[PDB]
Design a protein around this motif. Structure first.
Motif, PDB file in Angstrom:
ATOM      1  N   UNK A 104      21.968 -21.090  18.410  1.00 59.37           N
ATOM      2  CA  UNK A 104      20.522 -20.961  18.242  1.00 59.37           C
ATOM      3  C   UNK A 104      19.873 -21.909  19.242  1.00 59.37           C
ATOM      4  N   UNK A 105      19.414 -21.358  20.359  1.00 59.33           N
ATOM      5  CA  UNK A 105      18.995 -22.168  21.492  1.00 59.33           C
ATOM      6  C   UNK A 105      17.555 -22.642  21.399  1.00 59.33           C
ATOM      7  N   UNK A 106      16.704 -21.935  20.654  1.00 59.90           N
ATOM      8  CA  UNK A 106      15.304 -22.332  20.545  1.00 59.90           C
ATOM      9  C   UNK A 106      15.160 -23.601  19.717  1.00 59.90           C
ATOM     10  N   UNK A 107      15.878 -23.678  18.595  1.00 56.78           N
ATOM     11  CA  UNK A 107      15.855 -24.881  17.776  1.00 56.78           C
ATOM     12  C   UNK A 107      16.710 -25.977  18.405  1.00 56.78           C
ATOM     13  N   UNK A 108      17.568 -25.618  19.363  1.00 54.78           N
ATOM     14  CA  UNK A 108      18.417 -26.601  20.023  1.00 54.78           C
ATOM     15  C   UNK A 108      17.610 -27.540  20.908  1.00 54.78           C
ATOM     16  N   UNK A 109      16.583 -27.021  21.579  1.00 59.01           N
ATOM     17  CA  UNK A 109      15.779 -27.872  22.446  1.00 59.01           C
ATOM     18  C   UNK A 109      14.831 -28.759  21.658  1.00 59.01           C
ATOM     19  N   UNK A 115      12.858 -15.074  27.713  1.00 59.55           N
ATOM     20  CA  UNK A 115      11.478 -15.498  27.532  1.00 59.55           C
ATOM     21  C   UNK A 115      11.153 -15.788  26.072  1.00 59.55           C
ATOM     22  N   UNK A 116      11.920 -15.228  25.131  1.00 60.09           N
ATOM     23  CA  UNK A 116      11.648 -15.426  23.712  1.00 60.09           C
ATOM     24  C   UNK A 116      12.868 -15.747  22.861  1.00 60.09           C
ATOM     25  N   UNK A 117      14.077 -15.384  23.285  1.00 58.24           N
ATOM     26  CA  UNK A 117      15.292 -15.734  22.560  1.00 58.24           C
ATOM     27  C   UNK A 117      15.795 -17.120  22.925  1.00 58.24           C
ATOM     28  N   UNK A 118      14.995 -17.872  23.666  1.00 54.67           N
ATOM     29  CA  UNK A 118      15.403 -19.112  24.301  1.00 54.67           C
ATOM     30  C   UNK A 118      14.363 -20.214  24.192  1.00 54.67           C
ATOM     31  N   UNK A 119      13.121 -19.882  23.865  1.00 58.76           N
ATOM     32  CA  UNK A 119      11.983 -20.748  24.081  1.00 58.76           C
ATOM     33  C   UNK A 119      10.858 -19.899  24.628  1.00 58.76           C
TER      34      UNK A 119
END
Lengths: 50, 378, 52, 40
Positions: B256-261, B309-313
């Motif tokens: 889960x890369x969005x919550x990772x940052x 653009x959205x699955x990442x941030x």
């Protein structure tokens, strides 16, 4: 005694002697700290040694 | 003493370089410095912190009285009682040496150390002196003290006594974290985590868990990271306490890369309050971002960056500029694209990776036997 | 001490909370010590099923 | 062996590998890297 000149006993070891046997085989064994081998040597009322 | 002593070296750093971080550090350090009769090492801090205050003369007569109380103790001892080694002269004269680390500067302490090391035969008392040099060399980060006495510990001492060296297994790689060895040695011998009593030799436990989990995800990504830190049990107890660190772990592993940052920005901001800090903060985040990019570009050979653009941030152009810096960096083995807007990758093969290694190892040995053939034959 | 039936309770209840904190092998060792303790009691008439 | 062409000749301990790649691009990594989200 014309044949056999020396007859040699092997009694079970003393508490001072059970400590030294315990130090040889626990040499490569790795103990942490806070540990007393003399208390463990007194837990053997007449052990064989082996 | 010296057992909670490394918190002081944190508040020396945390007060100094961020001047904006100067509110509560000075409030509990100066009162802690007038405690424990701390008199020598703070004159440098008194230049960088608030100006001056006259309790110096009050604690100087206190530091002289405790010096003179032990001075008349061990001169009468060495002149009346004549049994030496690890005897009463020994522990009184190390109480001078313990006084000069607790109160004094290093110079009176080190010459008492090198005097008392030349007197003793019990290597446990010898190793305890080497424990004291290693700690005061960790205070002032003296790189020449630590290269000596670690060799004293490995070679000159530890052929005998056993399982007090695990205290130094936390130290040899604690010194590798303050160096740039944030990569493999520090993660390798922080892996034995079973030493929990928050001692002087085990300076803290919960922060030691955070230290061994930050450094761990750079040594190995998936040559079985999951057995030693995820399937590991006693490591999993204490990160079940800390909620953000476990969230920082499972964001990376469960992809889960969005919550990772959001976790990673908290880690970098929390990284700022460290005293072995100088190689961390620029180098840690830049390595972990390209760490997450390598596994994300893995399993794909045709990724559109609109999917990033959205699955990442967010920030289409932000991914675009950061991949462009990384591909030009000689890393992040792919090829970014314009108006098709499809990040295309490329990897070597069996033939391509085995030829690239043999073309380099061959030329190194070929250049090696250029010189060797000409050293001989004139 | 000398009383025995209270040990089987506190050995089993720790084996809950080590398993509750997701520590598997330490909860294994606490359960095994609870087994060899529970072999010398008049009746665990309900605590047997709690142990089992 | 003088060759007659001689006559002239973590502080920064592994710095130039970091510096040749990234120099000075707001290294707190939050004010734009973590703060894109006001745009969306």
């Amino acid at each position: 005694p014309g044949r056999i000149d020396r007859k040699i006993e092997f009694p079970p070891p003393n508490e001072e002697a059970r400590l030294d046997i315990l130090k040889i085989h626990s040499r490569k064994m790795n103990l942490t700290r806070g540990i007393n081998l003399r208390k463990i040597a007194e837990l053997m009322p007449g052990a064989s040694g082996a | 003493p010296k057992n909670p002593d490394l918190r002081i070296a944190q508040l020396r750093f945390l007060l100094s370089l961020p001047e904006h971080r100067g509110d509560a550090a000075v409030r509990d350090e100066l009162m802690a410095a007038v405690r424990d009769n701390n008199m020598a090492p703070y004159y440098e801090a008194l230049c960088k912190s608030l100006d001056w205050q006259i309790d110096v003369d009050l604690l100087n007569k206190m530091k002289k009285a405790n010096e003179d109380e032990l001075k008349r103790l061990d001169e009468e001892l060495e002149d009346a009682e004549k049994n030496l080694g690890e005897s009463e002269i020994r522990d009184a004269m190390m109480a001078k040496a313990e006084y000069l680390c607790r109160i004094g500067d290093k110079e009176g302490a080190l010459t008492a150390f090198r005097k008392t090391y030349d007197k003793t035969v019990a290597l446990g008392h010898r190793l305890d002196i080497v424990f004291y040099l290693l700690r005061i060399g960790l205070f002032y980060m003296d790189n020449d003290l630590i290269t000596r006495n670690t060799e004293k510990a490995k070679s000159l001492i530890e052929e005998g006594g056993d399982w007090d060296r695990r205290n130094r297994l936390k130290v040899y790689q604690g010194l590798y974290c303050v160096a740039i060895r944030d990569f493999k040695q520090a993660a390798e011998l922080f892996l034995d985590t079973v030493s929990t009593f928050t001692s002087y030799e085990l300076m803290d436990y919960k922060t030691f868990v955070t230290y061994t989990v930050y450094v761990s995800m750079i040594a190995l990504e998936r040559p079985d990271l999951r057995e030693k830190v995820i399937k590991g049990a006693e490591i999993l107890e204490v990160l079940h306490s800390l909620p953000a660190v476990r969230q920082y772990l499972f964001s990376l592993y469960e992809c889960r890369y969005s919550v990772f940052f959001q976790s990673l920005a908290v880690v970098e901001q929390e990284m700022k309050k460290d005293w072995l800090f100088a190689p961390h903060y620029r180098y840690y985040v830049r390595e972990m971002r390209i760490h997450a990019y390598s596994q994300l570009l893995e399993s794909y050979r045709s990724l559109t960056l609109g999917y990033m653009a959205e699955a990442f941030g967010v920030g289409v152009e932000f991914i675009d500029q950061e991949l462009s810096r990384f591909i030009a960096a000689g890393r992040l083995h792919c090829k970014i694209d314009k108006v098709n807007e499809i990040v295309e990758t490329n990897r070597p093969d069996s033939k391509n990776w085995q030829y690239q290694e043999t073309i380099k190892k061959g030329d190194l040995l070929l250049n090696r036997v250029q010189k060797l053939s000409r050293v001989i034959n004139m | 001490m000398d009383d025995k039936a209270l040990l089987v309770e506190v050995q089993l209840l720790e084996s809950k909370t080590y398993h509750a904190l997701s520590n598997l092998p330490k909860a294994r060792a606490a359960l095994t010590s609870a087994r060899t303790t529970a072999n010398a009691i008049y009746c665990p008439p309900k605590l047997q099923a709690t142990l089992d | 062996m003088s060759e007659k062409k001689q006559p002239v000749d973590e502080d920064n301990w592994d710095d130039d590998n970091v510096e040749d790649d990234f120099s000075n691009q707001l290294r707190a990594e939050l004010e734009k890297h973590g703060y894109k989200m006001e745009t969306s």
